[PDB]
């Protein structure tokens, strides 16, 4: 690793600087270096890791969607043949996206998940594993597409099982996991009813637990609850 010679604390410091500078590729490289030091991550460090890769892959996904849309329009009736370039460039972006997903999944498998014993860390990493398999599923078309989808489902399901046993219904990680697994059901697994049921049950169980929270925790939980409601409004 090109970060092997830099101190763990310096990598974390530079990840925070990269975030301030909106240099998310650098941020992700610094956090990958920090993970590869082999020590477990604190809550703030897990956040830095997730923010960095979410921004990198988010940009790739947006670009892939633009290119896929152009490619699909080129394959409609009456469209002038323009050669292999659109497919080639969509494939280039797709391959880079897959590489980033494989990198994140590799960090989770070697060895973040296996050392994560507390609910907050383990649920967080399993949510990430589901998310990055979900991004692989968005672009998948081959023999392994069903296995990629089931890998996302399996990671999300293990995270859900732990979160329901070990976290309150307002815990922001539990809420964000449910939000994303609901989107998985709607956009990946062709299961809109399950998506809607999960979002509604999650929202209602969080609502009933808000009374236990401080003002600051209430703000965190209600923010994610509003995203659940936003999706429900989009879907109904």
């Amino acid at each position: 690793g090109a970060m092997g010679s830099m101190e763990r604390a310096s990598l974390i410091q530079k990840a925070k600087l990269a975030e301030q500078a909106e240099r998310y590729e650098d941020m992700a490289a610094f956090m990958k270096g920090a993970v590869e030091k082999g020590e477990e991550l604190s809550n703030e460090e897990r956040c830095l890791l997730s923010v960095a890769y979410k921004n990198v892959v988010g940009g790739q996904r947006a670009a892939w969607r633009v290119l896929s849309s152009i490619e699909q329009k080129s394959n409609e009736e009456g469209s002038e043949e323009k050669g292999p370039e659109v497919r080639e460039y969509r494939e280039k972006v797709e391959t880079e996206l897959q590489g980033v997903c494989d990198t994140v999944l590799g960090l989770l498998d070697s060895h973040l998940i296996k050392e994560a014993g507390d609910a907050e860390s383990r649920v967080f990493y399993l949510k990430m594993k589901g998310d990055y398999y979900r991004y692989l599923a968005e672009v998948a078309t081959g023999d392994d597409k069903k296995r990629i989808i089931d890998s996302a489902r399996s990671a999300y399901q293990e995270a859900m099982d732990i979160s329901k046993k070990e976290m309150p219904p307002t815990n922001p990680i539990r809420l964000g996991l449910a939000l994303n697994f609901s989107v998985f059901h709607y956009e990946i697994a062709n299961s809109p009813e399950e998506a809607i049921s999960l979002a509604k049950t999650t929202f209602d169980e969080a609502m009933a637990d808000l009374h236990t929270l401080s003002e600051d925790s209430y703000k965190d939980s209600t923010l994610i609850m509003q995203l659940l409601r936003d999706n429900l409004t989009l879907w109904t």
Binding site: D131, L179, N180, Y186, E187, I224, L227, N231, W235
Partner: peptide, 5 residues
């Protein structure tokens, strides 16, 4: 697209 975090 729907919201994810």
């Amino acid at each position: 697209f729907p919201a994810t975090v």
